[PDB]
Write an enzyme that holds these catalytic residues in place. Structure first.
Site, PDB file in Angstrom:
ATOM      1  N   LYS A 100      54.727 -21.665  29.851  1.00 23.76           N
ATOM      2  CA  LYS A 100      54.362 -20.795  28.736  1.00 23.76           C
ATOM      3  C   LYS A 100      54.084 -21.587  27.460  1.00 23.76           C
ATOM      4  O   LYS A 100      53.146 -21.263  26.721  1.00 23.76           O
ATOM      5  CB  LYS A 100      55.457 -19.756  28.496  1.00 23.76           C
ATOM      6  CG  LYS A 100      56.870 -20.257  28.726  1.00 23.76           C
ATOM      7  CD  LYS A 100      57.845 -19.098  28.850  1.00 23.76           C
ATOM      8  CE  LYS A 100      59.275 -19.587  28.987  1.00 23.76           C
ATOM      9  NZ  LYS A 100      59.490 -20.332  30.254  1.00 23.76           N
TER      10      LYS A 100
ATOM     11  N   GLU B 215      64.288 -24.336  21.021  1.00 24.39           N
ATOM     12  CA  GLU B 215      63.485 -25.297  21.768  1.00 24.39           C
ATOM     13  C   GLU B 215      64.041 -26.685  21.499  1.00 24.39           C
ATOM     14  O   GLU B 215      64.732 -26.912  20.503  1.00 24.39           O
ATOM     15  CB  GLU B 215      62.004 -25.227  21.379  1.00 24.39           C
ATOM     16  CG  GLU B 215      61.643 -26.036  20.143  1.00 24.39           C
ATOM     17  CD  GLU B 215      62.238 -25.462  18.873  1.00 24.39           C
ATOM     18  OE1 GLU B 215      62.452 -24.234  18.817  1.00 24.39           O
ATOM     19  OE2 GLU B 215      62.495 -26.241  17.932  1.00 24.39           O
ATOM     20  N   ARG B 216      63.730 -27.611  22.400  1.00 22.14           N
ATOM     21  CA  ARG B 216      64.191 -28.983  22.252  1.00 22.14           C
ATOM     22  C   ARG B 216      63.521 -29.652  21.058  1.00 22.14           C
ATOM     23  O   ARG B 216      62.359 -29.380  20.743  1.00 22.14           O
ATOM     24  CB  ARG B 216      63.914 -29.768  23.532  1.00 22.14           C
ATOM     25  CG  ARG B 216      64.233 -28.983  24.795  1.00 22.14           C
ATOM     26  CD  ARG B 216      63.524 -29.549  26.013  1.00 22.14           C
ATOM     27  NE  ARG B 216      63.831 -28.787  27.217  1.00 22.14           N
ATOM     28  CZ  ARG B 216      63.341 -27.585  27.491  1.00 22.14           C
ATOM     29  NH1 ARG B 216      62.500 -26.978  26.671  1.00 22.14           N
ATOM     30  NH2 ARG B 216      63.705 -26.978  28.616  1.00 22.14           N
TER      31      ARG B 216
HETATM   32  N1  LIG Z   1      47.835 -25.969  32.712  1.00 22.67           N
HETATM   33  C1  LIG Z   1      48.673 -26.993  32.905  1.00 22.67           C
HETATM   34  N2  LIG Z   1      48.183 -28.250  32.821  1.00 22.67           N
HETATM   35  C2  LIG Z   1      49.012 -29.278  33.016  1.00 22.67           C
HETATM   36  N3  LIG Z   1      50.315 -29.257  33.299  1.00 22.67           N
HETATM   37  C3  LIG Z   1      50.774 -28.003  33.379  1.00 22.67           C
HETATM   38  C4  LIG Z   1      50.040 -26.842  33.202  1.00 22.67           C
HETATM   39  N4  LIG Z   1      50.845 -25.724  33.359  1.00 22.67           N
HETATM   40  C5  LIG Z   1      52.026 -26.227  33.623  1.00 22.67           C
HETATM   41  N5  LIG Z   1      52.057 -27.596  33.652  1.00 22.67           N
HETATM   42  C6  LIG Z   1      53.223 -28.435  33.912  1.00 22.67           C
HETATM   43  O1  LIG Z   1      54.326 -27.584  34.174  1.00 22.67           O
HETATM   44  C7  LIG Z   1      55.439 -27.929  33.322  1.00 22.67           C
HETATM   45  C8  LIG Z   1      55.595 -26.891  32.240  1.00 22.67           C
HETATM   46  O2  LIG Z   1      56.140 -27.547  31.077  1.00 22.67           O
HETATM   47  P1  LIG Z   1      56.864 -26.729  29.938  1.00 22.67           P
HETATM   48  O3  LIG Z   1      58.092 -27.406  29.477  1.00 22.67           O
HETATM   49  O4  LIG Z   1      55.843 -26.431  28.843  1.00 22.67           O
HETATM   50  O5  LIG Z   1      57.196 -25.354  30.644  1.00 22.67           O
HETATM   51  P2  LIG Z   1      57.480 -23.857  30.188  1.00 22.67           P
HETATM   52  O6  LIG Z   1      57.741 -23.042  31.452  1.00 22.67           O
HETATM   53  O7  LIG Z   1      56.416 -23.343  29.307  1.00 22.67           O
HETATM   54  O8  LIG Z   1      58.864 -24.003  29.421  1.00 22.67           O
HETATM   55  P3  LIG Z   1      59.422 -24.324  27.958  1.00 22.67           P
HETATM   56  O9  LIG Z   1      59.400 -23.100  27.107  1.00 22.67           O
HETATM   57  O10 LIG Z   1      60.826 -24.882  28.194  1.00 22.67           O
HETATM   58  O11 LIG Z   1      58.518 -25.444  27.438  1.00 22.67           O
HETATM   59  C9  LIG Z   1      55.140 -29.336  32.820  1.00 22.67           C
HETATM   60  O12 LIG Z   1      55.620 -30.319  33.728  1.00 22.67           O
HETATM   61  C10 LIG Z   1      53.613 -29.339  32.737  1.00 22.67           C
HETATM   62  O13 LIG Z   1      53.089 -30.647  32.934  1.00 22.67           O
HETATM   63 MG   LIG Z   2      57.190 -24.001  27.715  1.00 20.66          MG
END
Ligand SMILES: Nc1ncnc2c1ncn2[C@@H]1O[C@H](COP(=O)(O)OP(=O)(O)OP(=O)(O)O)[C@@H](O)[C@H]1O
Ligand SMILES: [Mg+2]
Ligand SMILES: Nc1ncnc2c1ncn2[C@@H]1O[C@H](COP(=O)(O)OP(=O)(O)OP(=O)(O)O)[C@@H](O)[C@H]1O
Ligand SMILES: [Mg+2]
Lengths: 47, 464, 516
Positions: free
Chosen positions: B159, B185-186
């Protein structure tokens, strides 16, 4: 003629899986609800 | 006049006052803490009256190193934060002190953090077709200008990456002011975001405010109110369009649950605090666009262990109009956007205001995906050889479509070397019509994975 | 300065009429507050559910008594409450001012005009708590309450005085059905005498203000704004308004019902009210039970939903109909409130989401829905035309489960499968398009007799629509007959058969073929 009996036995064996899974699901639901009510009453009475 | 402290435990502190001196609810109080190495100034906000000239409250700073008998002073006023044009291009904490410069911004006017939602007599629905460059959002669930937009999903689904891509794509084409608020968030994410914004000229156009999780629960519950105060001040007087982004919403509800555990109230189902819905509704009513002023807000909501039966997501769903959620099954499959079309929905998608071709294409693709989801188990167990010709054709079409919704984005540059790609709306509509007609079935499996445009699809086809 | 003269006259008349009296009363003091409740002591004698009064202008009610303490609930603004205020016992149990000027406006749950329109008039005050009509003041139910939906009145009829329930999953279309029903009565209102007139009311609980504005705009555009009123309790309000609004709505509707005018109450959501009551009860420190719910919660609903019932001719023969709406999650029905509300009412309309995903837009389940009244609330003509298609649909789905992979079948089985598929494809309908009784009967008669069995299933609906339009243009006698006698005559059937044949002779969709 050999083919028909395989399907018959397959359906007959498939019914019991439904039965057993239904029993397991009901048991799990009852356990979950009783655990939740026990926890909430224990938390409420402590104060 | 001043009071004393009689009890201390956790973050909650209770104090005593003489007759005719008790302050009203939500009044700031100052306390002095002294030590050889730990010297600070505790800031407390009144929570409730215990009677007998006793008032119980919480603190915004760690309570380590406090001793009973220390006098507590009152200011007779609520929390406030400076506002104005000079706030732009700076970083602030919850209390309002400027983190970049310790002395900066201590002379502007100040506003109380607590406000009132706008009256019902000045509400008007907003309908507009705001288009981005991403296929799934353009086709399935179009976004609405001046309305609510939010995401959903478990941990590690992507997200934050989507939010970063969205803001990068929009803030370059905006004439208004944007405000960023970080609830939980971190610290690495915040530092990287600040550096990335500094890499361009957009930083001078936006204002950032955020608090982290290591702080006591008092601070995590107040950052959103300050951000809303700043956004409301920008909207009300300047008469200008505003953008607002919130990283998370679950965090302050968690903080409220934590504090209400100690405040003395009984718990509720799934160990949540009572009257969470009331607080959520009171806060969510602030973000609203009147007849003459428009504000667009994008939020992200976390869910625990991928369970939609949890009361908090169910409660917060009712405040939304345009929604898009993420699933873990599609992420484990491999598709990167990981958007599930079956459950997501919009509120402007009807042929009354949109061309009928869009509606027809959406209905056809939804029906095809639903049928494939139905036939899943039979395909897995009895195999493709058992089905008829129609089922096989729909299975192949479903595979083609499911592969086609993937798309690479610029934010993936750090993770993968593939560059960014963007496609307009009409091309996507025509491509989806062609695919649902069934004239591209001769292509192999890998030709439909990570494809931006139709010409790119043809080029990849000639490459195998 | 005529307006200025009127203003000056009103001001002078009010100011010269100032009068007050010196009377004694009991006054108590607040000891503690916070979290939406406050404790007040010093009041010797106060009735339960008394409407207190506070110095700042805010209001409150008394729920819990004690030997030396009185609980309270703050309705409106809360931050002005502080230790040291003086309360003043006033009046008696709270009431609502009901009248006849409420039509076409939006009011506060307490009875205040939150709309931008000026103040409203008042006719008489009615207390919320009153006993329901006895068991010896009711008749049987027999009346065709239309709904404007083909599936609803074909499967599950609705009559006057009948409580019908709609339980649905998230994002299914309950509100659309409610709005279609609420605006279907424009033609009924246009008639002179009030024998067909119905005065409808709407209640909204725990919803965003923009949604309420959109609903009001839709109703205004529909032209039904003239004979309806809205009660709104948005999320920004305290728990008191969300707890108390439905009683106000029910009382306002009941006053109209009691004098011989038909009404129609609609409750938008009941889960929010239960949640608000649970929050209040937990905050007042009362013993909890299963699912953190108080014991009396069931009783609560029984006190509210039971008000509506048909009346006898001795008291004027009024009526009232309720349509509560319930939201369920994860297609689960074994939850507490769903089971209670299901067991307390009669008749259900399940709204599955799988059906709404593809195909049917109304998305109404057929094998679980039921109506208790049934044929006692039907029209004779459409009852004759119905032809018991329920069993046909049931065996159609049962057989088509088998015949998906089967190509060699019995000829009668194939005919039944085709008939079922045609009926299912016919039963669909778009939104914002109510239908009157006569066209529904005509369409059902066309479906049942097998006239359209030669039409390919892909393009039936359009064809049907065209036929209807043509039937409305060059013919008007059949509508007059069905309106006047409420029965389908054989000669009208023959004329309709001739019309259908001559129209079907000249219609094509794609490589079509007109046949006998
Ligand atoms: N469209 C994308 N392109 C490249 N990498 C992606 C994509 N979508 C997801 N990822 C990968 O999936 C993971 C998601 O990272 P991220 O920490 O932003 O997750 P999140 O579910 O949004 O959680 P948070 O709120 O903790 O950041 C990462 O390892 C990222 O590299
Ligand atoms: Mg995220
Ligand atoms: N007959 C129909 N044909 C086409 N679209 C329909 C039809 N009925 C409903 N819809 C659409 O389905 C959606 C239902 O929206 P609605 O306002 O009825 O909400 P709901 O499903 O009752 O849920 P909630 O009250 O929880 O928001 C809307 O997008 C509406 O346009
Ligand atoms: Mg709805």
């Amino acid at each position: 003629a050999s083919r028909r009996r395989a399907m018959k036995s397959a359906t007959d064996n498939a019914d019991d899986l439904i039965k057993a899974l239904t029993l397991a699901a009901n048991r799990e639901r009852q356990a979950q609800i009783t655990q939740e009510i026990s926890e909430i009453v224990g938390g409420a009475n402590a104060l | 006049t001043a009071g004393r402290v009689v009890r201390i435990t956790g973050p909650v502190v209770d104090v005593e006052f003489p007759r005719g001196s008790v302050p009203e609810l939500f009044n700031a109080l100052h306390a002095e803490i002294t030590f050889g190495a730990l010297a600070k100034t505790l800031t407390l906000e009144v929570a409730q009256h215990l009677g007998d000239s006793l008032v119980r409250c919480i603190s915004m700073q760690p309570t380590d190193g406090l001793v009973r008998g220390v006098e507590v002073t009152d200011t007779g006023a609520s929390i406030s934060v400076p506002v104005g044009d000079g706030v732009k291009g700076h970083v602030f904490n919850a209390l309002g002190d400027c983190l970049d410069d310790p002395g900066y911004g201590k002379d502007f006017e100040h506003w109380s953090i607590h406000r009132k939602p706008p009256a019902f007599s000045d509400l008007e629905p907003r309908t507009e077709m705001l288009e981005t460059g991403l296929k799934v959002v353009d086709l399935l669930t179009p976004y609405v200008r001046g309305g609510k937009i939010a995401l959903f999903g478990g941990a590690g689904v992507g997200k934050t990456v989507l939010i970063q891509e969205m803001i990068n794509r929009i803030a370059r084409n905006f004439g208004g002011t944007s405000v960023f608020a970080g609830v939980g968030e971190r610290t690495r994410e915040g530092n990287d975001l600040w550096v990335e914004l500094a890499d361009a000229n957009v930083l001078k156009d936006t204002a950032l405010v955020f608090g982290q999780m290591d702080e006591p629960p008092g601070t995590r519950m107040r950052v959103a109110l300050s951000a809303l105060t700043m956004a409301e001040f920008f909207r009300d007087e300047q008469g200008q369009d505003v953008l607002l982004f919130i990283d998370n919403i679950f965090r302050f509800t968690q903080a409220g649950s934590e504090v209400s555990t100690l405040l003395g109230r009984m718990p509720s189902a799934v160990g949540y605090q009572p009257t969470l819905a009331d607080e959520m509704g009171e806060l969510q009513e602030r973000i609203t666009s009147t007849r003459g002023r428009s504000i667009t807000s994008m939020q992200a909501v976390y869910v625990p262990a991928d369970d939609y039966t949890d009361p908090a997501p169910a409660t917060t769903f009712a405040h939304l109009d345009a929604t898009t959620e993420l699933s873990r099954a599609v992420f484990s499959k491999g598709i990167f956007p990981a958007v599930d079309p079956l459950a997501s929905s919009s509120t402007i998608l009807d042929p009354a205001i949109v061309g009928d071709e869009h509606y027809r294409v959406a209905q056809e693709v939804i029906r095809i995906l639903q049928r494939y989801k139905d036939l899943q188990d039979i395909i897995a167990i009895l195999g493709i050889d058992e089905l008829s010709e129609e089922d096989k054709q729909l299975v192949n079409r479903a595979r083609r479509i499911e592969r086609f919704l993937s798309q690479n984005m610029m934010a993936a540059e750090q993770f993968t070397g593939q560059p960014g790609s963007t496609v307009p709306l009409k091309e996507t509509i025509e491509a989806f019509d062609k695919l649902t007609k069934g004239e591209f079935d001769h292509l192999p499996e890998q030709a439909f994975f990570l494809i931006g445009g139709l010409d790119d699809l043809a080029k990849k086809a000639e490459s195998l | 300065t005529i307006s200025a003269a009127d203003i000056e006259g009103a001001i002078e008349d009010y100011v010269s009429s100032f009068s007050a009296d010196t009377e004694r009363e009991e006054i108590g003091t607040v000891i503690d507050a916070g979290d939406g409740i406050a404790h007040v002591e010093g009041l010797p004698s106060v009735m339960t559910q008394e409407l207190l009064e506070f110095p700042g202008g805010v209001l409150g009610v008394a729920l819990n008594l004690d030997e030396h303490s009185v609980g309270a609930v703050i309705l409106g603004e809360f931050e002005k409450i502080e230790e040291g205020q003086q309360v003043k016992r006033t009046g008696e149990v709270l009431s609502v001012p009901v009248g006849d000027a409420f039509l076409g406006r939006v009011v506060n749950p307490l009875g205040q005009p939150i709309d931008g329109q000026g103040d409203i008039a008042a006719e008489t005050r009615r207390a919320l708590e009153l006993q329901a009509p006895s068991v010896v003041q009711r008749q049987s139910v027999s009346e065709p309450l239309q709904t404007g939906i083909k599936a609803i009145d074909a499967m599950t009829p609705i009559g006057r005085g009948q409580r019908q329930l709609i339980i649905g999953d998230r994002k299914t279309g309950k509100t659309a059905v409610c709005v279609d029903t609420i605006l279907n009565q424009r033609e009924a209102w246009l008639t002179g005498d009030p024998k067909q007139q119905v005065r409808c009311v709407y209640v909204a609980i725990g919803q965003k203000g923009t949604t309420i504005a959109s609903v009001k705009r839709a109703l205004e555009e529909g032209g039904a704004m003239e004979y309806t009123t809205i009660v709104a309790a948005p999320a920004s309000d305290a728990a008191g308004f969300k707890w108390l609004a439905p009683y106000t709505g029910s009382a306002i509707g009941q006053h109209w019902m009691y004098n011989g005018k038909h009404v129609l109450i609609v409750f938008d959501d009941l889960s929010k009210q239960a949640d608000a009551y649970r929050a209040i009860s937990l905050l007042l420190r009362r013993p909890p039970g299963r699912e953190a719910f108080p014991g009396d919660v069931f009783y609560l609903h029984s006190r509210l939903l039971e008000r509506c019932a048909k009346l006898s001719d001795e008291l004027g023969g009024g009526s009232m109909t309720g349509l509560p709406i319930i939201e369920t999650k994860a297609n689960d029905i074994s939850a507490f409130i769903p089971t209670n509300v299901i067991s307390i009412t009669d008749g259900q309309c399940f709204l599955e989401s799988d059906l709404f995903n593809q195909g049917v837009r109304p998305a109404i389940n057929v094998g679980v829905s039921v109506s208790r009244v049934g044929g006692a609330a039907q029209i004779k003509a459409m009852k004759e035309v119905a032809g018991s298609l329920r069993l046909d649909l049931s065996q159609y789905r049962e057989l088509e489960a088998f015949a998906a992979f089967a190509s060699d079948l019995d000829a009668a089985s194939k005919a039944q499968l085709d008939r079922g598929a045609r009926l299912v494809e016919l039963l669909k309908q778009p939104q914002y398009s109510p239908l009157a009784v006569e066209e529904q009967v005509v369409a059902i008669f066309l479906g049942t007799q097998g006239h359209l069995d030669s039409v390919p299933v892909e393009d039936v609906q359009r064809f049907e629509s065209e036929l209807l339009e043509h039937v409305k243009a060059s013919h008007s006698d059949i509508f007059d007959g069905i309106r006047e006698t409420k029965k389908l005559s054989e000669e009208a059937e023959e004329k309709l058969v001739s019309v259908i044949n001559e129209f079907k002779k000249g219609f094509q969709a794609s490589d079509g073929s007109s046949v006998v």
